[PDB]
């Protein structure tokens, strides 16, 4: 009771979700939209001063309490890997320092950066408009092949989004929300949070045993990037063969991923993967 009324751990975990776990949607939405606008325009985005300015401008609007803990100092293979190493911090006042560790901070950063990458892919798909390409028969056929590849890609990315939503976050967050109330012990609650974060980490495919798995998906994710630039570059930067080879790579990755999912599920490796299986074979 003293910690709950005094140090406001409930609010601390709420901010944890809001920022590190994609719940302060509008703010970080705008933040990474600006970041992706900077990236696509070849603009300065790695600027640490720019990052801190953006972070503070974002957080102060809704959470002045958090407009201090949120700090971006990121410093810098694949266009997705450009987002790797993102810097993000939090303020854990003692005796809440016992609750939150630096390993906790690192895992939060990992999950947040995976969220940022998937949101980057989603934003890249969303920003393109069919009118954007139209304003910019073989050309028509190339446009159709663009359209088919984009539809396939968007279905994949939407399945990924929904999987992140509920397989890893909605259910895990709801469970931790309930189970924190039921833990009257400091050690018990610490164990609860540790297990909740470990479960989120595992559902985020971050374990080594499935690294190749994610190594497959991010490649497809990377295929979006030059796709979107190729979407905006008109059809003079694409031909029949370019689009068709992109789609062949996509389909090879898709079949490989479906096979891997089926094998792993039949082996009983993990029961939340079948979600991803059904999502992949949904279309």
């Amino acid at each position: 009771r003293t910690l709950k009324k005094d140090y406001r751990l409930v609010e601390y975990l709420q901010a944890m979700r809001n920022f590190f776990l994609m719940e302060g949607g509008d703010t970080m939405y705008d933040f990474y939209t600006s970041i992706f606008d900077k990236i696509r325009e070849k603009e300065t985005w790695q600027n640490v001063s720019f990052l801190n300015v953006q972070l503070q401008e974002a957080v102060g609007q809704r959470y002045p309490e958090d407009s201090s803990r949120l700090s971006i100092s990121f410093e810098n293979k694949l266009p997705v890997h450009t987002l790797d190493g993102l810097t993000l911090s939090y303020k854990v006042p003692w005796p809440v320092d016992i609750v939150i560790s630096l390993e906790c901070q690192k895992i939060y950063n990992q999950v947040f950066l995976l969220l940022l990458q998937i949101k980057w892919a989603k934003y890249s798909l969303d920003v393109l408009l069919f009118g954007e390409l139209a304003s910019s028969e073989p050309v028509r056929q190339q446009i159709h092949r663009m359209f088919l590849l984009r539809v396939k890609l968007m279905h994949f990315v939407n399945s990924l989004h929904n999987y992140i939503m509920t397989r890893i976050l909605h259910s895990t967050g709801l469970e931790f929300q309930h189970q924190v109330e039921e833990a009257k012990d400091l050690d018990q609650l610490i164990k609860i949070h540790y297990r909740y974060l470990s479960t989120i980490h595992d559902r985020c495919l971050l374990r080594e045993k499935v690294s190749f798995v994610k190594e497959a998906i991010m490649k497809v994710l990377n295929l979006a990037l030059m796709f979107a630039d190729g979407w905006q570059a008109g059809l003079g930067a694409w031909q029949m063969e370019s689009i068709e080879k992109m789609e062949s790579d996509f389909k090879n990755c898709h079949m490989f991923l479906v096979t891997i999912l089926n094998k792993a599920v039949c082996r009983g490796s993990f029961p939340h993967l079948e979600s991803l299986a059904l999502s992949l074979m949904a279309g």
Partner: protein, 357 residues
Amino acid sequence: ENQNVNILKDQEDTFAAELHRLKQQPLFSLVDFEQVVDRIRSTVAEHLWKLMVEESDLLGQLKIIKDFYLLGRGELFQAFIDTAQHMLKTPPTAVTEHDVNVAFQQSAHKVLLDDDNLLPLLHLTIEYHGKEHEAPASGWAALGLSYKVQWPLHILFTPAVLEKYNVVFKYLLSVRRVQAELQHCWALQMQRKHLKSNQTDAVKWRLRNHMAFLVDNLQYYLQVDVLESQFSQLLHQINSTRDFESIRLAHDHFLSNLLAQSFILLKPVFHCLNEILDLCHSFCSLVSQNLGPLDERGAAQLSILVKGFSRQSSLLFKILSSVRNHQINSDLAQLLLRLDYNKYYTQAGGTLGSFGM
């Protein structure tokens, strides 16, 4: 106490007083020890009976067992077999179990098993040497049911009863498979009514009607005699009883009667039943061979099958006539009488399939 953590009310004082009184006896009285033990056992068993019958829902457990472990959802199991025949016709692999469980759950959803929170607790299992890496050459050859029992009812549910359920479900699923085969063959022969009858068609229809009568008698007996009496008697036992051990022995004899009626414990009759199952499968396959009227090879294989059927029918009559002059099982007598609704076997000479091609 374990399930309280994870029973004596307040008479513990009386029990301690009685134990002290027994201790104060100069000469030990075994009768008094026994009577104290029996009184305490009655108290404990009454506490268990009241905690189990009314607030542990043993009735619902038994209902669910009979519905699924013992058949009773005809649409469910029918659709399940219809779906899984294609996959279980082959020897199983490491993915057959998951696939058949998926089919089961989806069919149950389709057959409107939508209010069962035990649906996620009703699972399948396939047993196969190639699934452990003569092994089962079909998914229908070895299939069990996985169900979850918790405190305190799982204490009653020993694994032995579980494999009893498994084997009885195997028997019933085999008989239902033969039922479905005969049903589809009957529909195919129904289709011929827009055509004209052939000699082979007539012989096919006669053999079909023969085995239809046989399996229908078998399954009507199985539903009524093998099941209704035992379920009813166990229900009356549990309703009347007031003690744990009484319920235990009641269900014990209930399943004992069930297994006695199953007639698997009798080697000869079990072998003959297997033979007739194989013959029914072969007849259905042969009918499946010709979409229209059977050809010459179809006629020849039908003749071979009819010869085997007549041989096995004589065998089954004579094993049903193993002893009809001295003592024999009463349920077997009932089964034969069900076969002798007008003694067609005696009319048929003690065999079926003795009619010319």
